[PDB]
C-alpha cells in the first residue's frame, strides 16, 4: 500500500488517478485541484462561448461526488498546492476559500499542473476591462457574461495560433465582427506558409480581418482602442489574448527540480523528475519529439491523457512501456475547413538544417463520381534518400481527420513514404477512391525518392523563369480560367506528344498543370524522350493561392 | 543497359488493366501497349453502378472516369474496345482476338501478356430462371442500363434480391431509394459473410427499420409465373416484379484454363510472388488471381478494387525489373454503407479463425465517434480479434453512423505495419472535440485488448453466458436500477457499480462471479475492484447492449 498524491485534476491528473485505482484497491489516492471542477472539458470552452455547446453542464464530464465514489478517491477541490517539501516528502496545501494551509505527506507525488496563458507587457493591459484569456470555466463564464451584458459589436483576437483561431470562429458565429492580430506572417505556426494561405483565404471569405506581422503597441481608452506597431488603430469592444502558454512549473522550480526548454519540468523516460519520488506529466513537461528526439514542449490533450495512463502502469502496472516521444498530431476546425498537422514542418526542419523534400498532393475526399466529393490537400515532408517521413499537413472540407490519422499511424509505426502506397484502406464510393489520397501522396513521394521525377517548389518557379527557364503549362485551355504563372507557354497534355518539336532541347524545361498530376505525366514523357525537365509541385492551384498577386492573366 | 522496348498486351481495361497500362507508359515511351476490352467502355466505375440505379448518381457519363479517345491519346495506347480475346496461344506467343463489331478475328503477337479478366457473377441453376423475364445481374454498364430501363418503363413495385453479400445489400439500399419495396433472401443466417453474427444483428435491425424484409436460412427453390413468383425452400412464396441476383462471383479464368495455365484455389489463376503465371511471359492480376491473405498467408480469392489497382501498379514496376517491393498479400479491407449505417471489416473474422484452428480472443468496445459534449456524437462499435499471447491482430470489425471509415483505416494501417494490440493505445491521433476524444475509439479497443493480454481481466462472450448461468454461475448486473427496464439477462442480480464497494458483503465467495453492465466498461471496473479483493470474476464482453441485440428473444423484462 502506497500513498499517492496527484496535483492537478484535469487531463493528466484524472487519467492517472482512475487507472491507479483500477490497478490497486489498496493505495490511498489523493487528488488536489485548485479550481472548483475536475475532469472538465477545457477544449469545449470555445464552443460553449460560441453557443455550439448550448448546455453548460455538458462541459462538466464527471462530478467530484460521483468520481470519488466510483474510484474511492480522496478528491480535494479549491486546494492549491503551494510548496513541495521533498526531503520531508510532504506538500503544503492552501485552501482557496479561507487561505488556511496544511501539510500532506506522500509516498509518491505526481505533478500534472498544466500550462498557463502568456501575458505580454503591453502599456495599458491593466486598465483593460474587456481583456480575456481562456483557460478554465470561471474565465469562460467571465467572457460569456461579458458578451451577454455589453453585447460587443467587435472583438480583437491577439495571437493567431490554435486557441486564437477557434476563438475567432466562435465569436464570428455569434455574429461579432473579428480582427485577428498576428506577429507572424501567418496563422497557426505548426503549419507551413503555403498551407496557411488556404486558411487565410477561407477566414477572409467569412469576413475576418487578418492583420499580419503586427503587434499591439498600446491599449488606449480602457482597451477599447488598440494601437498597432504598424500605426493602425483598432476600435474594439473586447480583446481576447491568445499568444501561447507556458508550463506551470513554479512548484517544481521551488522544489529545486531540474528544468528544461521553456521552463518545462525535465523528466526521464518514466516521467520521473530529478527527485526519485516525484513524477510529472502533461503540458508542464519537456518531451522529445518522436521524429528527431529534440527536446520540446507540446501542450496537447492526447499526450497528457496517454502520459497519465502510462505513468499509472509504471507505478502499479506490469511491463514498463517507455514514452518514445510526441508526434504532435493536431487538428482544428476553421469554419468549414479542417486543418491537421503531424511531425515537423519545413520551418523547423530548415531551423535544424535537416535536408528534406516535400510533395503537395490534392485529391478528392471520396470517389469523384459520388455526390459531394471535396478536395483534400496533403503535404508530405520526407527524406529523399531513406524515405523517412518527417511530417505531414492536410486540409479540406471533409475526410481530413481520416487521412491525418493514417499518416500519423504510419510515422509512429516507422513506415516510409515507400510503404504508404501499400496501405490497404477501405474503398467504397462514399468514403474513398480506389487509390486513397494517402496512397497517392505515397506514390508522388516515392517517385521523387526513386528518381522518376524532379520537382521545384512554388517559391522557386518565378525566379527560375526570370533566369531563362522554359515553363510549359499543360492544362487544357478551359482550365486557364483563374490565370497562370508569368512566363507560361500553354501546350495541353493531350497535344504535347504530337507537338514535341516545339519544346527546346537545349533548355531546362519546367512543367506545371492545375494540381501537379498531368505535369508529372508530361514530365515522364519528356524525360523518357531525353529532355531535362522538372514538374512544379502543387501546380498552379497552390502557386495562385499562396502568391495571388503574381498571377498573370 | 536500360530498357529494351517490348510489345505488351493487356487483357481487360478496367481496375487491373487500366492501372497497369498507365504506369507502364509512364515507365517507357517506346513500348507498344495494347489494351483489349470486350465491353464498350474502359475504366468505368462499376462500384458506382448501384448508385446510378438508385439515382444517387444522376449522370451516366459520370461513371465513365476515362474515355477511350482521351486515354489512348494521353498515354499513346492502342485501346481496342468491343474486342474479345478468345484464345491464348502461349507457345506461338499470340492471342486470338474477335472484334465484336465487325466479326473479324485476328492474331496478336505479344512479348508480354497481362491478364486482368476479373470475376463473373455466379448464376445458379434454379428451375424457371431461363423463363424469368425480370431477373438481372450487375457487372457492367449494359447490365445497369437494362435494369434502369426496366424500372422506368415497367414501374416495379416490389423487388427481391437474392444474396445478402456487400453487393446484394447495396442493391437493396438503392432499390428502396427509388421507392421500391424490397425483400432480401439470404441462405446464411446473416447478411454480409465477412462480418460476424453479432455485428450482423445490428445491421439487420437497421435494414428492418428501413422496411426491408429479411428472409434468412432460405433459398429460392423455383421461379414460377415467369419470375413473378419466387418459391422458397421452406415452401413460402414471394410475389415480386423483379429479381436481382447477387449470390457471389467466380474468376474469369477460362482463357487460362484453355491455355493450360495453372489454377489456384477456387479456379483462380495461380501466380507467383511476381504475378507470373505458369508461363514466364504471361502475368495475371485482379479478381481472377490467387492471393495470400496478409494475416495468415492462406491462399485465397479477394475480389476488391483496391488490391486490383495496387497489383496492376506493382506489376508495371515488376515488368521493368523494379522488384524491391513485391506484393505482401491482401488484408481484405472492406467498407459498406447500409442506409444510415457504415459497416467496415479487415483481416479475419471469428468464423474463419475457427475454420483454421487458430486460438483467438475478441473484445467488443462501443465508444463515441467524437467528444460527447460536442453535438451529434454517435456511438461506434469496434470488435477486435487478437492473439492473447502475442497481441497479434487477426482482424477488426466496425459499425456506426459516423467515424467508422476512419477507425478501420487506422486499424488496417496498424495490422499492415505489424502492430500488436499493445501498440494501439500508443497511436497519437488528432484530438479536437468535433473529430475525436482524448482517447480515440481505436486507443480504447487497444486498452481493452491489452487488459486481456496482460491478464487484468477475463471475459466471457454473449454466446457463453446463458449456459454458464444454467450451470450455476452467479451473474451480477452492475447497472443502475432504472437501466433494467430495458431488460436483462436471465439469472441477473442487481448491484449498482457505485454501491458495489459498500455492498461487497452480498457477493458470494463460494461462486464464480460474472459481471454485466450496459456496454462492458462499468462491468470491467467492477471486475477490477473484485479481483483486487481476491474474488474470481469475469466480465461479459459487450455488456447487455450486445446480448440483447443478438439474442432479443432471451431478454427478461
Ligand atoms: C481553450 C482551450 C482549448 C484547447 N483545445 C484543445 C484541443 O482541441 N485539443 C488538444 O489536444 N488540446 C487542447 N487544449 C490543450 C489541453 O487542454 C491541454 O494540453 C491539457 O489539458 C493538458 O493537461 P494537463 O493535465 O497538463 O493540464 P490541465 O488540464 O490544464 O490541468 C492542470 C490542472 O492543475 C491545476 N493546478 C495547477 N497548479 C496547481 C496547484 N499548484 N495546485 C493545485 N492545482 C493546480 C490547474 O487548476 C488545472 O486544473 C486546449 C486548451 C485550452 C485552454
Ligand atoms: C456492382 C459492383 C460493385 C462493386 N463495389 C465495390 C466496392 O464498393 N469496393 C470494392 O473494393 N470493390 C467493389 N467491386 C468489385 C470491383 O469492381 C472489382 O474487384 C474490380 O473491378 C476487379 O478488377 P479486375 O481488373 O480484376 O476486373 P474487372 O474490373 O471486372 O475488369 C475485367 C475486364 O476484363 C474484360 N474481359 C474479360 N475477359 C475478356 C476477354 N476474354 N477479352 C477481352 N476482355 C475481357 C471484362 O469485360 C472486364 O471489363 C464491385 C463490383 C461490382 C460489380
Ligand atoms: C474521464 C476521466 C474523468 C477518467 O478517465 P477513465 O476512468 O480512464 O475513463 P476512460 O473512459 O478514459 O477509460 C475507460 C476504461 O474502461 C475500459 N473500457 C472502456 N470501454 C470498455 C468496454 N466496452 N469493455 C471493457 N473495457 C472498457 C478502458 O480500457 C479503460 O480502462 P483502463 O484504462 O483501465 O484500460 C478522465 O479521463 C478525464 O479527466 N477526462 C477529461 C480530461 C480531458 O481529456 N481533458 C481535455 C479537455 S476536453
Ligand atoms: C484512372 C486509372 C486509369 C489509373 O490511371 P493512372 O494514370 O494511374 O491515374 P491516377 O490518377 O491514379 O494517377 C496517379 C499517378 O499520378 C501521380 N500523382 C497523382 N497526384 C499527383 C500530384 N499532385 N503530383 C505528382 N504526381 C501525382 C501518382 O504518383 C501516380 O503516378 P505513378 O503511378 O506513376 O506513381 C485507373 O485506375 C482506372 O481506370 N480506374 C477506374 C477503374 C476502377 O478502379 N474500377 C474498379 C471499380 S471503381
Ligand atoms: N505580441 C504578439 N502579438 C500578436 N501575436 C503574437 C504575439 N506574440 C505571439 N504571437 C502569436 O500568437 C500565436 C500563439 O499561438 P500558440 O503558440 O499556438 O499558442 P495557443 O495555441 O495557446 O494560441 C502564435 O501564432 C504567435 O506567433
Please tally the β strands of chain A and state the result: 32
Largest interface (C-beta under 8 Å): A-B, 87 and 88 residues
Characterize the main sheet of chain A.
5 strands, parallel
Number of helices of chain A: 15
Query: Remind me, CATH topology of the largest domain in chain A?
Result: FAD/NAD(P)-binding domain
Q: How does the overall form of chain A come out from the CA principal axes? A: globular
Q: How big a fraction of the residues of chain A is strand?
A: 15-25%
Reading off the top of the CATH hierarchy, the class of the largest domain in chain A is best stated as Alpha Beta
Ligand species? flavin-adenine dinucleotide, coenzyme A, adenosine-5'-diphosphate
Domain count of chain A: 3
Under the CATH scheme, the architecture of the largest domain in chain A is 3-Layer(bba) Sandwich
Give a brief outline of the structure.
Chain A is α/β, with parallel strands linked by helices. In chain A, 27% of the residues lie in helices and 25% in strands. Chain B: This is Pyridine nucleotide-disulfide oxidoreductase, class I.
Can you walk through the features of this model?
Two copies of one chain form a homodimer. With 553 residues, chain A is α/β, with parallel strands linked by helices. Chain A has three domains: 193 residues, FAD/NAD(P)-binding domain (3-Layer(bba) Sandwich); 258 residues, FAD/NAD(P)-binding domain (3-Layer(bba) Sandwich), CATH 3.50.50.60; 102 residues, Rhodanese-like domain (Oxidized Rhodanese, domain 1), CATH 3.40.250. Helices cover 27% and strands 25% of the residues of chain A. In chain A, helix 6 links the parallel strand 11 and strand 12. The longest helix of chain A has 16 residues. In chain A, 53% of the residues are buried. Bound molecules: flavin-adenine dinucleotide (FAD) (2 copies), coenzyme A (2 copies) and adenosine-5'-diphosphate. One coenzyme A sits at the interface of chains B and A.
